[PDB]
Design a protein around this ligand. Structure first.
Ligand SMILES: [Zn+2]
Ligand SMILES: [Zn+2]
Length: 231
């Protein structure tokens, strides 16, 4: 039922309905000869849509917009990128050209610039300190603290009890650390516990990469990160 790499041709995107007015988007990218899936989120905002994260590249992100307009048929008016990596900002230029207002925290925008990645236009205030939350249309944005990256945000949809962890949260099948080049291993379990404290009622938890689950994914991620810490 949830799509994997084997169900997604190169440069295509799939939409998966999680709950009423809430979808994930799933795309793939090839890295060093292996193929990785990646998730974002789409949340209905009345008669418009809010996008969370690009689909990891210009071509994928163009495909995403085409699939949204085919399947849902409401305008994507705003996009939020949850950290500075290319799976989150890669395609911001496509979105911007298409008339989508692109947003990220000032932390994310600065780190994207340093990496020479695409840079969302707008800055999101009110997310600079661990435990900070702001409402953005139909979602709450939450800065849990440094984890996968120092700027990583999580997104909650209160209407549907959907928690989107992005790349701060690992799927259950992931048994060893992923890309930790930009991580704060020391703080990552603390940051996960802020998430648990703030969204204990979450019914659906979506990782940045791989299969949705429940709140078990939070402790799962903590285990993996602590094991890596002790490598
Ligand atoms: Zn990342
Ligand atoms: Zn990622």
């Amino acid at each position: 039922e949830y799509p994997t790499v084997s169900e997604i041709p190169v440069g295509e995107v799939r939409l998966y309905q999680i709950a009423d007015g809430v979808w994930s988007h799933i795309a793939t990218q090839s890295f060093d000869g292996a193929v990785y899936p990646s998730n974002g989120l789409i949340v209905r905002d009345g008669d418009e849509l809010l996008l969370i994260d690009t689909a990891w590249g210009a071509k994928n992100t163009a495909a995403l917009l085409a699939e949204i307009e085919k399947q849902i048929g409401l305008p994507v008016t705003r996009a939020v990128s949850t950290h500075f990596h290319d799976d989150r900002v890669g395609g911001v230029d496509v979105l911007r050209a298409a008339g989508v207002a692109t947003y990220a925290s000032p932390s994310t925008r600065r780190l994207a610039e340093v990496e020479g990645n695409e840079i969302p236009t707008h800055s999101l205030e009110g997310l600079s300190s661990s435990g900070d939350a702001v409402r953005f249309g139909p979602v709450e944005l939450f800065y849990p603290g440094a984890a996968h990256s120092t700027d990583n945000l999580v997104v909650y949809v209160p209407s549907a009890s959907v928690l989107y962890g992005g790349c701060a949260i690992y799927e259950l099948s992931r048994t060893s650390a992923g890309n930790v080049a930009d991580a704060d291993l020391a703080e990552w379990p603390t940051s996960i516990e802020r998430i648990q404290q703030h969204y204990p009622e979450a019914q659906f938890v979506i990782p940045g990469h791989g299969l949705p689950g429940g709140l078990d994914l939070l402790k799962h991620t903590t285990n993996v990160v602590k094991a890596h810490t002790n490598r």
